[PDB]
Amino acid sequence: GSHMQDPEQLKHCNGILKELLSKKHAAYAWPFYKPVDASALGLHDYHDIIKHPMDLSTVKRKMENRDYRDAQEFAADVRLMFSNCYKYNPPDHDVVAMARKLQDVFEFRYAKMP
């Protein structure tokens, strides 16, 4: 059920999303900008292992289209994106190191929800 706080909480989510896409974090956010192109990257098992792909451009489209009804729905998609990275790649992969840094940005600001 919609709560009167949902629009303002979704604005905070949109602010987080803008930050995740901003130049400040680009050195470690770039793998998450667009859907994994598994074939182009030679990751021919990606879609067998990752049944629910997610990336920031998809989160952005869903925000713009008002798909997310509350902050929790938005956060679940962002976390799914990171979990897919942790599931698919070995834990010492540089993309995992980047995911952990970007997820720290996300989690600490999401925790500051007004």
List residues near its own copies by CB under 8 A. 72, 75-76, 79, 82-84, 86-87, 91, 100, 103-104, 107-108, 110-113
**Rounded to 5 degrees, what are φ and ψ at 7?**
-55, -45
Partner from ligand TEP, its own copies, none contacting 41, C-beta within 5 to 8 A by type: ligand TEP
Residue among 20, 21, 36, 56 that touches ligand TEP (CB under 6 A): 36
DSSP 30: G
Stretch that binds ligand TEP, among 5-13, 58-66, 83-91, 106-114 (CB under 6 A): 83-91
Distance CA 61, CA 82 (A): 18
Distance CA 61, CA 49 (A): 24
54 C-beta neighbours (distance < 10 Å), count? 22
**Which parts of this chain interact with ligand TEP (CB under 6 A)?**
26, 30-31, 36, 41, 85, 88-89, 95
